[PDB]
Amino acid sequence: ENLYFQSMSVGFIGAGQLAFALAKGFTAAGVLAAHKIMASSPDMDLATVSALRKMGVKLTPHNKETVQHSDVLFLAVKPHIIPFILDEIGADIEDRHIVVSCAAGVTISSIEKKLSAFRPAPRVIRCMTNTPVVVREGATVYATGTHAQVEDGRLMEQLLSSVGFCTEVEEDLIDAVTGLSGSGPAYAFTALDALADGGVKMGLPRRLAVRLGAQALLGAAKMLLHSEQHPGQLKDNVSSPGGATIHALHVLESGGFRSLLINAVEASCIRTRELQS
Amino acid sequence: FQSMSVGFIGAGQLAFALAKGFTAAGVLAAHKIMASSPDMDLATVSALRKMGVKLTPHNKETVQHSDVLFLAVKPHIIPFILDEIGADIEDRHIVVSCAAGVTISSIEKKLSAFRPAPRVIRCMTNTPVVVREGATVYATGTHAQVEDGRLMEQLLSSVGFCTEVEEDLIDAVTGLSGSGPAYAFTALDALADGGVKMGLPRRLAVRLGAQALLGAAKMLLHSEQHPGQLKDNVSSPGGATIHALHVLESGGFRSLLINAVEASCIRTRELQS
Amino acid sequence: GTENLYFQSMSVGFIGAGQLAFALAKGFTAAGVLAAHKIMASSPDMDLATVSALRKMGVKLTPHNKETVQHSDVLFLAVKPHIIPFILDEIGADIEDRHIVVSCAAGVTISSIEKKLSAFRPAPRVIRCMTNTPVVVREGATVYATGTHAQVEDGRLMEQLLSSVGFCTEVEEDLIDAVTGLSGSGPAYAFTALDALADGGVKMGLPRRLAVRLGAQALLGAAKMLLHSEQHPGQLKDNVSSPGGATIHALHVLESGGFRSLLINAVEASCIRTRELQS
Amino acid sequence: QSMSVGFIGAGQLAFALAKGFTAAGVLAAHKIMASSPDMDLATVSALRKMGVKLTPHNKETVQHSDVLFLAVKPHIIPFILDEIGADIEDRHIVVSCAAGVTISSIEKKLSAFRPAPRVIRCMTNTPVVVREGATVYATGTHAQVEDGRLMEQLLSSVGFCTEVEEDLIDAVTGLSGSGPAYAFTALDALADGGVKMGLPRRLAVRLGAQALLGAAKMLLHSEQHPGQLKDNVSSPGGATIHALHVLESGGFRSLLINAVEASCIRTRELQSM
Amino acid sequence: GTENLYFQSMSVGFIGAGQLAFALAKGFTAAGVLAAHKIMASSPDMDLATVSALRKMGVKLTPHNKETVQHSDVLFLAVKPHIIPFILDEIGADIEDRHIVVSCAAGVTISSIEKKLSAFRPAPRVIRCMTNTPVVVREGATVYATGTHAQVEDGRLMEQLLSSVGFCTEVEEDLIDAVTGLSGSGPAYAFTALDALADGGVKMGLPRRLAVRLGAQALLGAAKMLLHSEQHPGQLKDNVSSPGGATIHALHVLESGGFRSLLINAVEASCIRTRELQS
Ligand SMILES: O=C(O)[C@@H]1CCCO1
Ligand SMILES: O=C(O)[C@@H]1CCCO1
Ligand SMILES: O=C(O)[C@@H]1CCCO1
Ligand SMILES: O=C(O)[C@@H]1CCCO1
Ligand SMILES: O=C(O)[C@@H]1CCCO1
Ligand SMILES: [Cl-]
Ligand SMILES: [Cl-]
């Protein structure tokens, strides 16, 4: 409530979906002014880059510049880019820097080793977040590195709590979190496209069908979050005997609806582990 | 509309959720709501009691109390309820049927036997009205004045999304957003089973699953982008997400959700026939 | 129609005179960028129908791969992967400074082409590409990657020549196996789909000719529509699907069969196999 | 020459047709008029932006037009015919675009008002917007040869167009009518496969779209059976025959057959209701 | 080769000049039982490739169905089921005593042909048959049933003529829908199977031409083997399946797919549909 990080300067290495979404969320929350944020990207023609520019974020094609501007430094690049970045700017890492890796599957140990060759005790945090931070409803976990100070973790939680749920986890849960909350929105966007197709099949106009399906999913998740009851208990509550809902639940069960989502989280988590190896 | 009194026939899950939403929105003092049911021992009735809603076993007390009257009963008991308080409808009443499948025409027919020009509105809503995030559609009957629709949309918008639709879409809406939250509750339970299988504590897995679906849905509502395009924005080449999407595709994920909506809508038609 | 290019100092050679050689030779000359007599092709079997078609076009034909190398500036290796090593050993001594060797084989890497040719001569100019037979109607899809000693002008020239018969862009070589899976095998997926759609039209009482014509016109127009649209394919799908209508009923039976999943499996199988065809 | 076109219905079809016609420069955007019962549609906004005259009144559209496209849902058609039937004049050519609705029923409704209505039934698709449509039509009892000739060359300006027997039109609807939607699904999924194997999304969409376009075109210009073209480019042991095999194992062919059949059967249902 | 028959007083007519007419005309003349100029065919579309092929053979062609009736003694109705009623009404008045009307349409019953023709003339001589296009290589499969007024000589003559281009036997009419399901649609099942087997050969590295040749030779020889064997097909299958060997592994994957069941479904679907094509 009126939170604001007076002297924090934030840098994004990578200027894609994730950098844009966090900068949008951070400035939406009012915890940072746009001009105290800087992002660098190898392609300065991404639509995400020009969106950042309209926000008032500082843009540069040199990762060195970003590192020099930043106190908190987000590595918002793909997993295989991380070693190319850590080697490019490892010499520029200074005392003050907190390096926050958002790359899937990439471990704190690997980041700390690459940076420790240039300089001892880099302050490293690993996190998994998602793009819904752009509407301030992200899901974020983080794990603190060996040399992260106690304040570094509390700082980063306070920053990331401003754009959604945020908590600390042991690092060895992050791969699984990537499969649930990290890939989660994509499952929901697939689910929502299909629900709308169902509504359209039954005669709803597409605009209405998309709006209704998204509101229904939004309300159910808010309901569960605010409820002390089991998701199955809530389902039981709204399933009238003989009714329309229980008939529909039966055809979800006949196709193994539940096991598909389990398969999804599994496949994503397993792939995440492979990206590291 | 600050002197408006609301009544409920049927003090079940829907009445509680609407009443909690209405009071949480501040549109309605709890004591200006009255509810009635034949089972006055339910927890829903006890919970409405704590809220400060007025309760009674007499549907007549509810009708004479109320200005806007919600019929929150099961589709097969509507004709009894209509027959029971049909002589007690007054000119001032707006009668809002909530039941699945029951047509405006059938309600206007029974009510007409007692009094010309009954003002009837049909709606399909859902239980997330209880955290003011419901999905609601409504259709106006023959004698519903335009002001009755504005009032209805104003009331129901305070507890979530609300739009007027033609009546012949409501069966389909039922299958989509009426039954929808139960689909999502199933999704979240299974997604949490997935997190647990991969090593997450159950509490953390429920939390992240719910937050992920909440954020995705909200993100789509604030976006000018098609949901497939958001899917595309967040799927890195060769990455974890596109791998998981492939296994969803292989089990026909999309078609099960189409199957669900279809089956709920089709069942909703059989409930009125 | 034509492309307003003309490579007036360019002699082109094809080693291999099968489907790909004839498609490219037909496309180039149809585009007007090359005259057929500046093209020479060679094959081990000179009775192939493709070789006769090349003779009708006026392309130069020879049984000897050395004659093609000596004739040509740009040299297309349009032979199967397992035959590339025998080709490179046969003609590696005849490569000269002017030659740009454009390998069309699936999965054969730049590294291994350069390694085989460098035993005869250092710094070979090598380009790897993946194209498809619709170049024969100037609607190919082509990607390329430049080798270690390819000059800047080499890739710009190859993109000029290949853009005249379809879409063409440069990629990193590590994407070509996956492109092979997608646009390299793409048309075979399409031919399968067009035959099945026509079968469906015939099942519903359409004559075969009409069903084939309409199915092809539908895919052509859909594909062109997406190419020129600013919208996601899902939004264009949505525009066609009238609520409660005929299209959405059909789409549901596609989804019930995991239609999307089969197309993903297909791109994945072709790509994975392409990787095996070098290792 | 002085031809005026009207659309009853201002949905997706009327917009692609109007966009197609003006792209061809067959007639000015302002010589087109569209009427819709909903003027808040994005299609009505889009038509408005390209310069087509809009009206909420079907009678205006009728009195504007010389060729009158009926582009509303099949079940709206008998209502339209009763509304504008007295306003049909001798000059009009009425072109029904609705799925399933037979020439015989349109001629019957309109006959109550004036003898010898000129009716034409057609099925087209949205690729008319890029002048690559697929269009069949049958002429009714009173269409003169000139009416069919004018029809053929108006629709040939925005893609393929041929005259067929009316009893083929339900089947055509399942094939080229719904066809682009099948293609769009195919192209989204192909792109997903490309992205799964490491391709950027934008490039994968582009290559997959280019491959369908090239293959369709090659087939149209070929004297070969598409199975022969398949075999021409399926190298023994190679990547394509491997990929073809996984298509076959899923019954790929049969799904597309089910799709044409499903759409065709639905088209017949639409007229029955 | 030839058949030692010659129907020297027989003029044959085909109403319809499509696949079946040309297959039969080619078979008959190849068998030597008829000269091409004693055959006349008529069609509504005289640009069909089948009509041009008939003109090469030397068959007589006419646009008028009446000219075919007047020319012919044996009159084949080689037209689609829904067109039979229009044919019979068009030429029913021109039927004479000498005519044997041989209907080839799927599902059209003798009763309904006799009923339609008897309005013009009592006691029409009608034969219903179901044959297939392999008559073009003298390996057709044909069954027939004689109508109410067909003479004993009519069926004996039809069996002579049809036995010269393949197998032929008389059946009760109530079996013809099921025969249609089996040998009438049979070859289309075979063409599908031969294309897929060749696909399987190509997957395993065989060139397409060789794979198509070997697949066809395998089915040809298997079918001929069973025709000449006194053994159940299962016993011949057993003879090929070396214990632990390659064939039995393949057979298991066929069984795991319900291969047998698909072929039963196919005969059942064709037969059931054939029954709908009259009702
Ligand atoms: O299950 C039913 O029938 C109703 C409709 C939607 C909510 O509960
Ligand atoms: O798709 C991926 O691999 C990453 C992880 C989760 C979101 O984007
Ligand atoms: O979906 C429908 O019903 C119509 C016909 C084909 C295109 O949109
Ligand atoms: O089938 C193959 O292996 C190659 C891929 C593209 C053309 O032929
Ligand atoms: O079954 C086998 O292994 C052998 C080879 C093919 C025929 O029998
Ligand atoms: Cl190809
Ligand atoms: Cl046959």
Numbering used by the authors:
A (entry chain C): -6 to 270
B (entry chain D): -2 to 270
C (entry chain A), E (entry chain A): -8 to 270
D (entry chain B): -1 to 271
Q: What does the primary publication say about this deposited structure?
A:
Pyrroline-5-carboxylate reductase 1 (PYCR1) catalyzes the biosynthetic half-reaction of the proline cycle by reducing Δ1-pyrroline-5-carboxylate (P5C) to proline through the oxidation of NAD(P)H. Many cancers alter their proline metabolism by up-regulating the proline cycle and proline biosynthesis, and knockdowns of PYCR1 lead to decreased cell proliferation. The biosynthetic half-reaction is the reduction of P5C to proline catalyzed by NAD(P)H-dependent P5C reductase isoform 1 (PYCR1). Electron density for each analog was present in the previously characterized proline-binding site, which is located in a dimer interface and consists of the αK–αL loop of one protomer and a kinked α-helix of the other protomer. In each case, the carboxylate of the analog binds in the αK–αL loop, while the ring contacts the kink between helices αH and αI of the opposite protomer of the dimer.
The crystal structures of human PYCR1 complexed with THFA, CPC, l-T4C, l-T2C, and NFLP were determined at high resolution limits of 1.75–2.35 Å. The electron density maps for THFA and NFLP were unambiguous and allowed for modeling of the inhibitor at full occupancy in all five chains of the asymmetric unit. The carboxylate of each inhibitor forms two hydrogen bonds with the side chain and backbone of Thr-238, plus a third hydrogen bond with a water molecule bound inside the αK–αL loop (“in-loop water”). Three of the analogs clearly formed hydrogen bonds to another water outside of the loop (THFA, l-T2C, and NFLP). CPC and THFA are weaker inhibitors and have estimated Ki values of 1 mm and 2 mm, respectively. For example, THFA and CPC are very weak inhibitors of PYCR1 (Ki > 1 mm). We note that THFA is a known inhibitor of PRODH and has proven to be a useful chemical probe of that enzyme both in cellulo and in vivo. The observation that THFA only negligibly inhibits PYCR1 confirms that the effects of THFA in cells and in vivo are likely because of on-target inhibition of PRODH.
